[PDB]
Design a protein around this ligand. Sequence first.
Ligand SMILES: Nc1ncnc2c1ncn2[C@@H]1O[C@H](COP(=O)(O)OP(=O)(O)OP(=O)(O)O)[C@@H](O)[C@H]1O
Ligand SMILES: [Mg+2]
Ligand SMILES: [Mg+2]
Length: 375
Amino acid sequence: HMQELFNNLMELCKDSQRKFFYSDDVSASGRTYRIFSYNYASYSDWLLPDALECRGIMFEMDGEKPVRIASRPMEKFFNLNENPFTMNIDLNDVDYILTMEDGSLVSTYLDGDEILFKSKGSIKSEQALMANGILMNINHHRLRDRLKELAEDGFTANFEFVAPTNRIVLAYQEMKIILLNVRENETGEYISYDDIYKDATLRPYLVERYEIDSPKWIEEAKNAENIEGYVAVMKDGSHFKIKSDWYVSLHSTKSSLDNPEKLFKTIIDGASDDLKAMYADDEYSYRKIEAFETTYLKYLDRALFLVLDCHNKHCGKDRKTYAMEAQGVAKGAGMDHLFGIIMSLYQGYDSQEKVMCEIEQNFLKNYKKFIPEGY
Ligand SMILES: Nc1ncnc2c1ncn2[C@@H]1O[C@H](COP(=O)(O)OP(=O)(O)OP(=O)(O)O)[C@@H](O)[C@H]1O
Ligand SMILES: [Mg+2]
Ligand SMILES: [Mg+2]
């Protein structure tokens, strides 16, 4: 049911805004939406109830109660050999594979009588509004009416937004939206690729599919150049990704395994999941990355708690009472570098995201204090 999904996602959000989090927003027709998403999660974090569904799913809210799943992107999936979810997979259970397109995800949602796009985290991001500019284009009037019909029937269409101005690694020639899959808002079930393919209105947009005889396509993908990789579709409908070493080496900081600052940078930037998959063959490198990952996730939880708890208890007091309490919390937690963080909050507290940026940047200034013991 919808409400137990909502309540389980809400549950995930009490832990830490480091981890799973939600954010409210209002569309141009004036109604509220809630997007559930995440910043950093570990393998144990992904085992909690419905955590794999907490990757951009959106509800329209009447205050605290949800009224409908307005949008439903793909479940979280991982690189092969990234963690136990993907480490003892029988490659013979692969049904087929899909070009992995290298842009930003956009998913449909119905707002009023309007069919619109949300990027993974927002209804108002630049990719979101750019994708809407495409949908409103007369040259996509026949795609848009189909997507509009799907959402009133409770299906979300998921595309990669790619463009010269949305460069990640791959250089596309032109700005487009590439339909990757369509999913049912209530069940999480997907319309089959073949069903989408034989709709000749949708087919022009649809990501390319390939057949495989046998798992040598894996190493060919790992060794290819000028591709991100492929998304594998299993006989049971689940997915995993496979990236080329070429993509991962450009998507990670250079020399990431030779330098602890660069490894922490890669982790902070959210690319250590692909790096460690790339180094799954090398148990020293894989477990080193994981140790740095654990260190930083553990620190971020601590730092965030201490900073936000301290700010919300003493916000508004005279500056040196506030300083006294900030002094206490930073010295008391063996984290004196946090004092400046807390005092930066004192004049102004915009988003809780800018707090994470300051914690994150500070961490990279003091990274040597934090290299896990033994490395
Ligand atoms: N054929 C495809 N099928 C599904 N997703 C695709 C496909 N091609 C590109 N993508 C994109 O791949 C994304 C997931 O893989 P990617 O490595 O880009 O994730 P990410 O942005 O690093 O997020 P995370 O690692 O947290 O899952 C999807 O959200 C989607 O935008
Ligand atoms: Mg991507
Ligand atoms: Mg990733």
